[PDB]
Amino acid sequence: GPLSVAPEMDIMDYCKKEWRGNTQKATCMKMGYEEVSQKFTSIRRVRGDNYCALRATLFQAMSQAVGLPPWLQDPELMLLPEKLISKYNWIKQWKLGDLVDKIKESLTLLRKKWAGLAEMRTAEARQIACDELFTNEAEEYSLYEAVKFLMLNRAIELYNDKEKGKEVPFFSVLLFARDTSNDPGQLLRNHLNQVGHTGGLEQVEMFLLAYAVRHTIQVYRLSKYNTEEFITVYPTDPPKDWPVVTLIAEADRHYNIPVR
Ligand SMILES: [Ca+2]
Ligand SMILES: [Cl-]
């Protein structure tokens, strides 16, 4: 299919096309892109479907991959679908975009693709491969199923930790505080099953995504330009060794990718 992450273009050309006229909002958006442009020259427009946060994050992460992270090296990753689903039968309420075989296939694909990108000797080779992966075919959407599953797993771990009275990050308190997400099954039925289908990730879920793929997500939040949230980093205090991916969000809904 066609690319789902558009070829790059100059960031201020993009801004000039999108934000015309004299409103306060347009001016704030221009200021926001000007700030991004201090560090990045170009932007790739990410398909604005209900997977956009996952597509933006994963595209960035994979296109920058120079190694296979330990969490993807771990043999336990491939065993996780069987163990989780066997233990928590309610995971069978998973809405696809048996179940154990499907999720395992998706995780295997994620690992295989990531490992192949990491092996590549030129960054251009990596960009070519990574473009081909994000062409709106079954493989792309399989990656999202894997990432969603990792999000569920991390949420289960955090919930169980909280139950045992163990220290957890505060975002997880906020995640489970939502009346539609009080436990992992509610998270699955009311939030994760909707992702890619009827809605995208909420703020608190961007922290969950970051934890699930062990990447630090630095977001220019243009609707927050004249405030301290003009950039928000997910999580706030990650391990120093998590790679960093940078995104742009005009309105905390849709994410695009700055490049240099
Ligand atoms: Ca190129
Ligand atoms: Cl034009």
Residue numbers in the entry: 78 to 174, 183 to 345
Sentences from the paper on this structure:
Here, we reveal a previously unannotated human DUB, OTULIN (also known as FAM105B), which is exquisitely specific for Met1 linkages. FAM105B comprises 352 amino acids (aa), and the OTU domain spans the majority of the protein (aa 80–352) and an N-terminal region with predicted helical content. Having established FAM105B as a Met1-linkage-specific OTU DUB, we named the enzyme OTULIN (OTU DUB with linear linkage specificity). Crystal structures of the OTULIN catalytic domain in complex with diubiquitin reveal Met1-specific Ub-binding sites and a mechanism of substrate-assisted catalysis in which the proximal Ub activates the catalytic triad of the protease.
There were no global structural perturbations, but His339 was now in the active rotamer, and Cys129 showed increased occupancy of the active rotamer. Both mutants stabilize His339 in the active conformation, generating a more reactive enzyme. Next, we tested whether the more reactive OTULIN N341D or D336A mutants showed improved diUb hydrolysis activity. Strong effects of Glu16 mutation were also observed in the OTULIN D336A mutant.
